[PDB]
RNA sequence: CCGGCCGGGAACUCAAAGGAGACUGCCAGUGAUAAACUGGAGGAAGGUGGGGAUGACGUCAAGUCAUCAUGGCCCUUACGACCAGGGCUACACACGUGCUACAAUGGCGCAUACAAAGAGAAGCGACCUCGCGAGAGCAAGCGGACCUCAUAAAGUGCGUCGUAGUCCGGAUUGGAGUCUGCAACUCGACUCCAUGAAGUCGGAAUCGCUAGUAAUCGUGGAUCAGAAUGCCACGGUGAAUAC
């Protein structure tokens, strides 16, 4: 990226339920390169979720994820000397690649015996935004915000 | 249930248990739950006393706990006994079988100091 | 030091192959000390006999031995002498029986070796190693080469510290495999040291 | 590569087959389920450097121990010396 | 009835014993299962390329060796002439049995 | 006649033989489930059928050797369209758009001596 | 441990010491062979054992039997 | 004999020789009507398609007199040569590179699908039989798209384990062996039975990789009697991210 400026590639709209957004999610939470586990993991915690809060499938995941999307960032900045932590409204097709980053990251960070149900709880706090990944959302915005004045 | 050692285990499924003993290392364990004839997955839960003293005697026949340990020590002893190079290593807390020392011997050696 | 052998990188394409046999292993192995056996027995005999390179091929059970020479009759002797004496030894050495065939070479001034071998004949003999490029040089766009180059190194006329000294003339694509690149290397062994001279010969392309 | 050592391998493939191979054959069924008259090993008293273990390897034009090949009989470093002349038939620089 | 295996290790070349085998054969006699690629074995010969340290250099030769079959299922004493002194190529290896 | 696809990807080499009958399908004498179906992407090798009807229209029977699961599922994938072939030119439009028609050249990437593998480099340090 | 099949020792050696049983024994003894399994018709006796500036006084006793004799003179002096 | 297995079959898979194909050339946007870029078309492959080979003149008196060669130097009944045994394997430590882990995206048992590329006659070694095993005896085919090494592992099934220094991890050590080789004490490699350290994810600091890559899973090979966590090759599954 220093002239190179690139697209993005495309994944596979997800063998299941058919969406890219979730065969995103898949490959995050997967691991050694183990699709034929990984799906196996997130359909079972999907389905933890599912029933466990009955709304259903698409509609679960959707809101869960809705509060661990954060809307603003900072980025770091060497000018004169200084690091200077810049604040920038970020864009939406990253406002979730990270929302799912983060769920992920905060359920293999966790007690549950299970993947399947460490990812299930992650959703479940999140649906009431009350999770690990979701205050990391708080502290995101609280970093900014306070460098509310560079703009 | 108390069995062979001063060891007194159980509470979980067999074969796992019966490692606890000093003596039987998964193989030893099959062999008994298999010459005693007993299911090997089961916990002493129905497990009858009348099984448990089957079993008391089959590993009875090998020199598990206090006798090993005394045993294995005799075996060291008499290494050191004879002055040999296997023993002078026992001796001077390095490893017997050859190992490199110029590094990582560690396990052998105790934690690094000085 | 970091140019690909000239010669080697061409095989594939436009140069050949100075051994054409075939050989399984089992004998790949004896195989290959015997050519270095022949190619070291023929060099010390036929050292003043300008040879260029010497090219062999066992056929099932043979061995045939061919001389690129420019001196021919020197190579071959009173009508039919010293190729026997040579065959002979020849045959005696890789065991299995040879022939022998001398090769014309066709203005030598071309063939790379040839030329290195010279400069190197003349370090020796004692010549100004500047001058002895220079000539070299010339005599071969003198007789076509669409390029050359000659270095030497080391120790040039007397030096305590080691010089290499190039001299290109014309046009010399290392780089273009198609192109006809005849490069050889001839060491010179002086009183002061050892001399070392490649020389490139640009001849074309396809 | 010091012409000594090199000798030393020369007489060490020379009694490799004068005894071994040959006579020392006299092992391999003289241990085998045929039982016992002990003297059947005891006889390991021949020249040592009369075993084929004993045969190092070397660059068969410098003597080098070292980077050998049994394609080429030679060190990685006369491979080459030769392979950039033809010198090695079917032999190149190759990629894929 | 006859196949004769051939392998060189240069192949615009051992494909020329081939069709010349094969050749002087149809003309012949004749009959002959065409000529068979087959799998051509290449070694790969990768070596240390200093004299001295840098294991990180090294070159990567490598030597294929080529395969033809050849077949011929009529054997006519005549063919028998043909594939006998009508033949050469030095560097190709012929194999009459199997 | 038998209306043949080859098709074939990374490894892999599946040919696809059609001919109109039902929604049945052999792969080296197996069940669709019996091979795969069943594992990562039993629905790939039934997908180049979507834009293009089946459900029990048209038969298939096919073998595939080298490579992998995804490998022989993809090598397939590309035999289907591929045999859509007969079946005119008009259907083999939006298998372009589809993408099914492309062979994915994506191959493995050699070992090339100094690394550690294609790309993996051994870490260093200054001192 | 190696060996299997017909336990090993130097004929020199083996000699050496029927050089001292019927004999009986005399000054210490010295072989250079550190690889010989010491046999029971070595007990009693003092075998020098080679390790590499000299040979260390080594008697054999009532189970120095499978062992070696390299096994009891040791090579590298470390203190 | 439900075994491409036998007739055949010359289609297909492949095999290895020879061919065409991709050029910013086609539409268009951008840019000075240019170069180029960008998007679209068709196409197996679009913008040097993917990878390799190829490393200019030169910089570091950079590395190699031990691969070899060689000027000078020095030893020469010793600085040379032969033999045994030892040593290069030492061990308070420090640093570099790696391998194995701390585990349920896992361990375990049983069932079970799918590779690639190499190797070989002083060789690869089937089959059978013996041995829990490593191995052994006997013995076929194979100079090899035929025969052998050779049952890929991740994977998928069931089941079990239930977050514990554990059914995680396997160091260390004891005991008993197996094979190579005159010879496994120093110091070989494997095996069976016991043994079950540290280790619950690693301070400061620091490295790799931009795609079939990283990550992970097995497979072969050169050296080699024997001795690979190294090295060189192979395919399996298969990401994230670039304002
Ligand atoms: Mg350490
Ligand atoms: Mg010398
Ligand atoms: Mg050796
Ligand atoms: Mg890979
Ligand atoms: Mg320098
Ligand atoms: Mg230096
Ligand atoms: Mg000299
Ligand atoms: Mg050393
Ligand atoms: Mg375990
Ligand atoms: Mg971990």
Known sequence: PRRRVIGQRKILPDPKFGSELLAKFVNILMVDGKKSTAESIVYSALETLAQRSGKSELEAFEVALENVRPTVEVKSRRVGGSTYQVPVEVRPVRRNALAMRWIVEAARKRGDKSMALRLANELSDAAENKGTAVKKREDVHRMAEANKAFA | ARIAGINIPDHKHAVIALTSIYGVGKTRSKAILAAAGIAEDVKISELSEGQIDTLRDEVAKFVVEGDLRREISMSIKRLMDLGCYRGLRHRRGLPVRGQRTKTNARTRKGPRKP | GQKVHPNGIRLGIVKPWNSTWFANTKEFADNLDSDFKVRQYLTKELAKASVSRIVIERPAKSIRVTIHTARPGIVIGKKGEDVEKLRKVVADIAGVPAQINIAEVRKPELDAKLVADSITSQLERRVMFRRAMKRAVQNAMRLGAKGIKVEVSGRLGGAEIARTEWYREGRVPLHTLRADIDYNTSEAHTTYGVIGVKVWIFKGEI | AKQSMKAREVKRVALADKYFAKRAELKAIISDVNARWNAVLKLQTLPRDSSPSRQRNRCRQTGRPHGFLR?????????????????????????? | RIRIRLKAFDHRLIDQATAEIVETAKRTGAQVRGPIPLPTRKERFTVLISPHVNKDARDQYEIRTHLRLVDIVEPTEKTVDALMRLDLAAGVDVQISL | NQYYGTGRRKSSAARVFIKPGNGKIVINQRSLEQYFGRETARMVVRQPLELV???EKLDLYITVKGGGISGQAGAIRHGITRALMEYDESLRSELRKAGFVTRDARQVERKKVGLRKA??????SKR | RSLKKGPFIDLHLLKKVEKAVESGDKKPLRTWSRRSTIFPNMIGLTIAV???????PVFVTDEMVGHK????APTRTYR
């Open chain 4, 71 to 96: 394609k080429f009989g030679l060190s990685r470093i006369k491979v080459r010396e030769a392979a950039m002349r033809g010198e090695i038939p079917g032999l190149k620089k190759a990629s894929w």
């Open chain 6, 53 to 55: 009807d089946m459900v």
């Open chain 6, 119 to 124: 790309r993996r480099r051994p870490q260093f």
């Open chain 7, 50 to 56: 080679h390790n590499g500036r000299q040979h260390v």
């Open chain 7, 69 to 72: 004799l390299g096994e009891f």
